Amino acid sequence: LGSSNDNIELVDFQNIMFYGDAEVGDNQQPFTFILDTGSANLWVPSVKCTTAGCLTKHLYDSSKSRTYEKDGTKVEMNYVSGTVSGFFSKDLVTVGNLSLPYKFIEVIDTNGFEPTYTASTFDGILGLGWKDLSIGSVDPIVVELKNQNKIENALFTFYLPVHDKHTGFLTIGGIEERFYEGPLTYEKLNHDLYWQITLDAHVGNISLEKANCIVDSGTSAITVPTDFLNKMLQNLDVIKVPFLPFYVTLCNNSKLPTFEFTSENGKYTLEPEYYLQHIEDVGPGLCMLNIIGLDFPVPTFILGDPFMRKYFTVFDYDNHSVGIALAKKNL
């Protein structure tokens, strides 16, 4: 194929999120995952799953895998959107076309991840974050694949799909020009936890210097600290439905600002067309901001799918940095 470059194809989910596939056990056993750079653990719904959410999912059968390596360590995987239960197990994970004995979680209780889990098409979540972000300290997949001379560089890359325009790819091992436009620009991680970097946040006249910015493929929206969100919805003609993170605006609202993130290396912007979600069925020419107030311990912005949809992103483990370039409209 492409020398040392994998390429797990991505497919959009409801035009907001995206999924990719991978397998466990020496007998393949395919699973649709959410490729989450926002987490560092790999879990899959087990045949031992007894919760309703699993009814619709592809399940993992260890007894059918010559590679299965038991463990049984009870484990709870916690996310911002939910919680998933099960236990540790090790088997042959296959991403793209590379396999490797990998440790993961067999989930048997998905009640804490509802209604999200039953309303989605994915089976499990495959973390792509850092070792310190995981549970049961598991070295990342791309790291191991590198530490096992299976790939050239300890880094993966994302080119999110566009529903009826083009699919996408999760390239592992190396960077490919077919995916981007203009020059790449690297920003150093301020910590080896989430793929978190430091940038100045500037929307209208609101500005947050040295804000923590998490590049997260596992987040469907653009997260913004509460205070910032409130000041941001000021002289705008947006409608917040009381007690709902539902902000309605006229898609053509000429007051809608453009997010501006900057460092001494570059300037990344996100215009309304990138963070607006069409809501035509609710009302004609109507849109919702797909932005949300979320306060972390330290002022943080989660650059979710909206950002990554406009910006081709490189996640370098070896250089501990994030590459950012404009994505090609088409392939």
Partner: peptide, 6 residues
């Protein structure tokens, strides 16, 4: 929405 780890 969906916000992926604690």
């Amino acid at each position: 929405x969906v916000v992926x780890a604690x």
